[PDB]
C-alpha cells in the first residue's frame, strides 16, 4: 500500500526533503482517559504544581530538523544559503500491521535522525488550569548568516561627523573650575558619536564559568537564576531573549539558562557531567545584541548640582526602545522547526524563543501496531549575492583520522550526532 | 570607448567571470628585433643551451586562474561542484592613451589577481632550433573531487572470492618439503585477491623532507633529480607524471621535482627559505595513483628451480599497462588553465603535466602607452549528485582573530594570497 | 506556561546542581533533563506581557528576577526584582 521514499532534491531555489521511517504504537492507558496531577507524582513544589489528563492516543512528531535533513544536506543548506523556510507538507501513513498543541515544547518522540532506526510513538496528553497535504503559511526566511559588521561601527572611519559632543566640564584642579567645552565627534573617539540604531533588548543572565573552581561555592542554580513569575509561581527564564552567549574571545563562560543544551548519545537523564551535554552559544549575534551576562548600559540617577555629583545606576533589563535592531535565535540540526503562536489579543515579534518559525497555523497534530511513515516538506532557499572578496567560513568536517567517522554508526550500530550545528556561516553587511 | 567589468554571474550550470585590468605597454628593444642565445650570457651548460629572438611586441596573458576568479568565487566553485571547464572567451582592449606558442609555459606577466593593481606587459619572445571572441574546443571536465574509496579496497568486505591463490609452497621445515597449497581469497586477506584494475603509471622521484635534519647532508638538488634526456640535453622532470605526493600520514615529505611550488608575496628571486614558498601536494590522488617516492611494485627477475630461489626486483618507472587508471594533476587558484598540445603524429592523454586543459587550438595569443583590458571566460559546471550521508570536507576561512585578513590588503596596501588552494574537496566513489 | 505535554521529556537540559554541598571547595556543574518532574525549569517559547507595579503577570507582583552581578569565588550570585518590564520579543499579553 506504499513504497519507500527517502531522498532530497535540490532544484533551483527550493529543496524537497523526503523522510520515511518505521513506527510502533503500543496501546496506552489501556484504551482509557486517566487523570494525572502533581499529587499523583507527589507534587513536591509550588512551581511544579500541575493538573490535566492523559489520553490513550499516540502522535507522529517530526518537529526537529535532523528528521528532514541528512548531515550532508544540512551542510549543503547552510554553506550555500542566506535563508530558508518551508513551503508545502505531504504526509503518508501506510503498510499498517496490527485540541491543545503540545508540539512546540521541544519534546522527545520525533522520528529518529537515522533512517534505519525504528521508534516508539509518544503518548499524548495535555494540561489545564492514509495521506494528507499541508500548506505552510507565509513566514520570513530564517536568517542563516552572521553579520560582518557591528552595530556601533557602521560609521565611515575616515570622516568626522558634523555633530558636537561635550568633552570637558572643568578647566582643571582647584575651586570654581567649571566650564563647558565641546569637541567634535571624530574617528579618534568613536564611542561618543551619535547613532541611528541601538542594540536589541536584554534580560540579564548569570554567567557560569566552565572552569568550576572560579565559580562560587554555593548552590546558585535556582536561587541565582533569572526567572519570571506568572500567577504566583516563579518560572525559570529559558532560554530567554536572544543575546550573545559571551563577549568576543571568551570561550569559558556561558549564560546559566540562556542557551539550548543538547545531550550526547547515551547521556543519562539525571545529573550528567558537563562533558556529557552539548551547550550551544549564540555568539554570532554579538554584533547587534547585548551579551546575555552583561548589563545593557547605564542611566543617570539624579540631577547634578554644585554639592551633588552626577550619579549613574546600572540597567539590568531593557525593553524595547525606538531604534533597536536584533537577531533572532539560531536554529540547529537538533533544534525545533516551528512553534505555534499562542492565541492572544496581541504579541510582539512572535518568533519563538527556542528558535524556528512561529506560525499561527502550524502543521496540525496527527493523532493515532507497526507501519511506515513518509513525510515530505518543501523548503525554499535564498542564495547569497555577496561581493565579499575573501573566502567565507564554511561548515567542514575535520580531516584528521579518528576511530569513528562523524554522523555515522559505530561498531555497535548506533548513530550519533557529535556536535550541535548552527545555521550561521556565510556573512552579510549590517 | 569602453566600460569596466568586474563581477561574476553564477547562473545554473554555468559561470561567467569578467575581469578588467589597467595596463602599461613600453617599447621593447627600442623598436628592434634581436637574435639571442646563451653564448651572449655565457651558457655554461648544454642543458641551458637555447637559440631565439626577442621582439618589440608585447602580449596579454590572462592564463592563470586567479585572473578570472576571486578567492570567494574560487571557494564557491570548488565546494559546490564536481567539475568545470571553459566554454567561451571574450577579450576587449580600450581606453588607449599614449608563430611559436609561448602561453603554455607558466610564465609571469599575467593580469594581476587584485583588480586595483596596474600590470606591465611582458615582452614577447621565442626560441627555435579592439575586441575578439573565442570558442574553447571540447575538453573533458576537470575532476574537482577526491575519491572516497581506494583502488585496492573496491571489494565487498563480507564475501569470499571464488578465485584461489597459492598460500604455501612447502609443508614446513625440512628437506623435500615442497607442496602446492591453495586458499580462498576473502575478507581475512585482501592483499592477494584478484582485481580488475591497477593504479596509474609511476616515474620515480626523490623524497625531500621539510625537516632539514632528516635530509642528507650533501647537495642533491640537480644531481639526485629525475630527468628526461632529449638530444644530449637533460631536462629536469617537472612536475612530471601525476602521482601522490606522500604516503598517508607523512606531510613533511615531498617529491623533489614533483610538485608545483609558488612564492609568497614579497619573495625574492633566488635561494629563498622554505618559509617563503608554498609547496603543493597531490595527496588527493593517493587512492588511484602510486606515491611519487615509492616503487610501482615488484616483478620476477628469474626462474625458480630446485637450486634457485624466487628473486624479485623493484619497478622504479612503470609505463602504461592495459587496465590502469589514474588521476590528472589538480588545478590551483594560481596555476595554469590551458596548454597547447604539441603538433605531432601521436600523443597519449594530452592533459598537461602542470594541470589544466590540453587544447590543440587554445585561446590565441594577443600581440600588441596605457589603457584597459577586460577579459571574460565562460565556465560550465558539473554538479554534485552524491548520496553521502555524513558531511564533506569544505574549504574554509579561519575563525580566529589575526593582525591581517587573508586574501586582502595590509596596512601598506599590499595584496597577498597566504596559501595555494586546490579544487578537490567533495568526494566520489571509485 | 503549562502548554507542555506532561507525559514526555524534553531533549533539552538545564543546570540543576552547582556544588556537592556540606563542604569546602565543592564545586561542579551537573545537568539534568528538563522533564515533567520539574516543570519550572523547562525552556519555553513565550513569556508573559509587560508590567508596571501597583501597590499577564499580577499587577501587585514583580515581573521576575535578573542577575545583578557577576558571581565568582568571592561573590555570591545576586538578583534584583523587576518592578516594570517593557516589551520583549516573544511576549504575549491579554488586553483589559
Amino acid at each position: 500500500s506504499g513504497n519507500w521514499h527517502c531522498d532530497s532534491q535540490w532544484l533551483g531555489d527550493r529543496v524537497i526533503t523526503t523522510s520515511t521511517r518505521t513506527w510502533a504504537l503500543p496501546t496506552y492507558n489501556n484504551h482509557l482517559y486517566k487523570q494525572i496531577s502533581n499529587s499523583t507524582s507527589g507534587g513536591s513544589s509550588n512551581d511544579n504544581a500541575y493538573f490535566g489528563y492523559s489520553t490513550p492516543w499516540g502522535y507522529f512528531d517530526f518537529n526537529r530538523f535532523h528528521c528532514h535533513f541528512s548531515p550532508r544536506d544540512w551542510q549543503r543548506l547552510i554553506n550555500n544559503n542566506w535563508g530558508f523556510r518551508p513551503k508545502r507538507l505531504n504526509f503518508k501513513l501506510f503498510n499498517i500491521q496490527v485540541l491543545p498543541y503540545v508540539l512546540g515544547s521541544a519534546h522527545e518522540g520525533c522520528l529518529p535522525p537515522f533512517p534505519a532506526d525504528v521508534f516508539m510513538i509518544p503518548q499524548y496528553g495535555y494540561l489545564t488550569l492514509f495521506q494528507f497535504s499541508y500548506e505552510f503559511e507565509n513566514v520570513p526566511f530564517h536568517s542563516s548568516y552572521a553579520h560582518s559588521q557591528s552595530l556601533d561601527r557602521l560609521m565611515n572611519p575616515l570622516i568626522d561627523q558634523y555633530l558636537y559632543y561635550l568633552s570637558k566640564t572643568i578647566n582643571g584642579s582647584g575651586q570654581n573650575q567649571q566650564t563647558l567645552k565641546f569637541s567634535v565627534a571624530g574617528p579618534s573617539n568613536m564611542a561618543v558619536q551619535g547613532r541611528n540604531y541601538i542594540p536589541g533588548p536584554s534580560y540579564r543572565q548569570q554567567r557560569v564559568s566552565t572552569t568550576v573552581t572560579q565559580n562560587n561555592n554555593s548552590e546558585f542554580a535556582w536561587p541565582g537564576a533569572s526567572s519570571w513569575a506568572l500567577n504566583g509561581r516563579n518560572s525559570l527564564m529559558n532560554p530567554g531573549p536572544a543575546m550573545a552567549s559571551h563577549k568576543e574571545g571568551e570561550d569559558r563562560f556561558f549564560p546559566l539558562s540562556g542557551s539550548l543544551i543538547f545531550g550526547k548519545q547515551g547521556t543519562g537523564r539525571d545529573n550528567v557531567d558537563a562533558d556529557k551535554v552539548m551547550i550551544t552559544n549564540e555568539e554570532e549575534i554579538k554584533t547587534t545584541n547585548p551579551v546575555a551576562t552583561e548589563s545593557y548600559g547605564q542611566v543617570a540617577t539624579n540631577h547634578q548640582s554644585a554639592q551633588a555629583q552626577a550619579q549613574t545606576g546600572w540597567v539590568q533589563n531593557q525593553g524595547i526602545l525606538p531604534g533597536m535592531v536584533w537577531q533572532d535565535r539560531d536554529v540547529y540540526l537538533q533544534g525545533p522547526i516551528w512553534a505555534k503562536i499562542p492565541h492572544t489579543d496581541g504579541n510582539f515579534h512572535p518568533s519563538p524563543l527556542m528558535g524556528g518559525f512561529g506560525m499561527k497555523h502550524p502543521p496540525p497534530q496527527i493523532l493515532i501496531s507497526t507501519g511506515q511513515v513518509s513525510v515530505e516538506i518543501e523548503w525554499e532557499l535564498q542564495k547569497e549575492n555577496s561581493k565579499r572578496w575573501n573566502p567565507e567560513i564554511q561548515y567542514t568536517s575535520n580531516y584528521y583520522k579518528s576511530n569513528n567517522v562523524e554522523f555515522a554508526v559505530n561498531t555497535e550500530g548506533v548513530y550519533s550526532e557529535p556536535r550541535p550545528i548552527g545555521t550561521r556561516y556565510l556573512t552579510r553587511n549590517l | 570607448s569602453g566600460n569596466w567589468h568586474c563581477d561574476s554571474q553564477w547562473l545554473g550550470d554555468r559561470v561567467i567571470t569578467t575581469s578588467t585590468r589597467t595596463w602599461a605597454l613600453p617599447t621593447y628593444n627600442n623598436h628592434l628585433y634581436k637574435q639571442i642565445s646563451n653564448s651572449t650570457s655565457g651558457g655554461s651548460s648544454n642543458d641551458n643551451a637555447y637559440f631565439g629572438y626577442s621582439t618589440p611586441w608585447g602580449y596579454f596573458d590572462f592564463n592563470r586562474f586567479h585572473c578570472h576568479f576571486s578567492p570567494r568565487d574560487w571557494q564557491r566553485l570548488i565546494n559546490n561542484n564536481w567539475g568545470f571547464r571553459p566554454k567561451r572567451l571574450n577579450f576587449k582592449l580600450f581606453n588607449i592613451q599614449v608563430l611559436p606558442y609561448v602561453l603554455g609555459s607558466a610564465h609571469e606577466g599575467c593580469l594581476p589577481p587584485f583588480p586595483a593593481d596596474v600590470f606591465m606587459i611582458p615582452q614577447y619572445g621565442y626560441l627555435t632550433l579592439f575586441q575578439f571572441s573565442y570558442e574553447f574546443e571540447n575538453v573533458p571536465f576537470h575532476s574537482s573531487y577526491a575519491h572516497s574509496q581506494s583502488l585496492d579496497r573496491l571489494m565487498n568486505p563480507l564475501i569470499d572470492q571464488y578465485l584461489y591463490y597459492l598460500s604455501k609452497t612447502i609443508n614446513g621445515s625440512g628437506q623435500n618439503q615442497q607442496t602446492l597449497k591453495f586458499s580462498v581469497a576473502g575478507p581475512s586477506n585482501m592483499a592477494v585477491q584478484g582485481r580488475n584494475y591497477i593504479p596509474g603509471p609511476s616515474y620515480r622521484q626523490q623524497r625531500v623532507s621539510t625537516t632539514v635534519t632528516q635530509n642528507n647532508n650533501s647537495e642533491f638538488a640537480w644531481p639526485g633529480a629525475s630527468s628526461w634526456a632529449l638530444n644530449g640535453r637533460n631536462s629536469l622532470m617537472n612536475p612530471g607524471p601525476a602521482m601522490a605526493s606522500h604516503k598517508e600520514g607523512e606531510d613533511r615529505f615531498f617529491p623533489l621535482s614533483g610538485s608545483l611550488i609558488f612564492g609568497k608575496q614579497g619573495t625574492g628571486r633566488d635561494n629563498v627559505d622554505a618559509d617563503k614558498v608554498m609547496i603543493t601536494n597531490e595527496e588527493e590522488i593517493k587512492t588511484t595513483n602510486p606515491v611519487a617516492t615509492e616503487s610501482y611494485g615488484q616483478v620476477a627477475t628469474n626462474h625458480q628451480s630446485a637450486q634457485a630461489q624466487a628473486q624479485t626486483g623493484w619497478v622504479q618507472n612503470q609505463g602504461i599497462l592495459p587496465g590502469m587508471v589514474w588521476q590528472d594533476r589538480d588545478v590551483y587558484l594560481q596555476g595554469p588553465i590551458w596548454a597547447k598540445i604539441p603538433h605531432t603524429d601521436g600523443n597519449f592523454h594530452p592533459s598537461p603535466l602542470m594541470g589544466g586543459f590540453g587544447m590543440k587550438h587554445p585561446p590565441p595569443q594577443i600581440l600588441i602607452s596605457t589603457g584597459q583590458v577586460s577579459v571574460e571566460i565562460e565556465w560550465e559546471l558539473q554538479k554534485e549528485n552524491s548520496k553521502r550521508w555524513n558531511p564533506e570536507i569544505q574549504y574554509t576561512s579561519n575563525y580566529y582573530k589575526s593582525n591581517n585578513v587573508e586574501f586582502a590588503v595590509n596596512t601598506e596596501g599590499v595584496y597577498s594570497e597566504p596559501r595555494p588552494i586546490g579544487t578537490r574537496y567533495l568526494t566520489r566513489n571509485l | 506556561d503549562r502548554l507542555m505535554n506532561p507525559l514526555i521529556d524534553q531533549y533539552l537540559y538545564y543546570l540543576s546542581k552547582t556544588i556537592n554541598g556540606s563542604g569546602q571547595n565543592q564545586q561542579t556543574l551537573k545537568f539534568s533533563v528538563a522533564g515533567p518532574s520539574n516543570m519550572a525549569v523547562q525552556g519555553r517559547n513565550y513569556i508573559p506581557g509587560p508590567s508596571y507595579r501597583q501597590q499577564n503577570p499580577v499587577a501587585t507582583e514583580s515581573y521576575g528576577q535578573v542577575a545583578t552581578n557577576h558571581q565568582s569565588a568571592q561573590a555570591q550570585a545576586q538578583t534584583g526584582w523587576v518592578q516594570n518590564q517593557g516589551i520583549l520579543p516573544g511576549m504575549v499579553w491579554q488586553d483589559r
Partner: antibody
Amino acid sequence: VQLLESGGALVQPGGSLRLSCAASGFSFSNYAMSWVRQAPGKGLEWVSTISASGGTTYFADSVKGHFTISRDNSKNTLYLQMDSLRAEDTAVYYCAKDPNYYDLSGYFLGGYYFDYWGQGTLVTVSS
Amino acid sequence: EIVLTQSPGTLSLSPGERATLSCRASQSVRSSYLAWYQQKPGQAPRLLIYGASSRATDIPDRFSGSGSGTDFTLTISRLEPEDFAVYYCQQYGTSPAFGGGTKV
C-alpha cells in the same frame, strides 16, 4: 601531529627566555595546548594550559607570575615565556595537545588528558 | 587543591609476571576522568588510559583501569618486559595534577 620546541637555553637566575612550540599535522587552532615540565630529579609536572582560541589561560601556583603562555593561531606556534626565572625552574618542557576539538559553536570545558607529546626542549637555570 | 598519592612504591619485573597499582586522591570531587601515562626514559611520554574506565587507542587490551570517588586503580594483566616503568595518574577534574608516580 608534530610538535617542536625552540628557545630552550641555559639562563642565569632572574633572566628570562621564550620557548615556542611549532605544530603541524593537526588543525592546531581547534585544540587547546599545554606545557608540562619534568625536572631531572622528579617526574612530570603540569605548568599551564591555553585554549584553542587563546581566550582562557590558567597556571600552576608553582609557576605563577614568572610564566605566561600565549599562542599564535596564524603562525601555528605555541609560546611559553619564562620571566624572572629561579633555580627551581630547570626541566624538560614538553609541548602537549588537548584531545577536544573547538569551534565557535560550543565552549571550552577545560583541560583533559594530554594526547600527543613533542620532544621537550631542556631549560637549565644555573650560574 | 587536590593531592594525589600513589599507594605502591616500586617493584622490578622479569617478563611474564603481572601486578596492579592504584592512587588515592584527597577530596576526589569528580571521578569520571583520570588518565594513566607510561614514560620510557630519555624520550617524550605516551598515553595509556583516558577516562576512569576507557582504554587508549594504541594500547593493548591487557591495559585497564577502574575507580570512582577518592579511590582509583590501574589493573593490568599479561604483563611483559616493555612494561616495567613509572605509572602516572592524572586527575584533570580540577586543574591538572599528577601523583608522584609508581615505578613498577
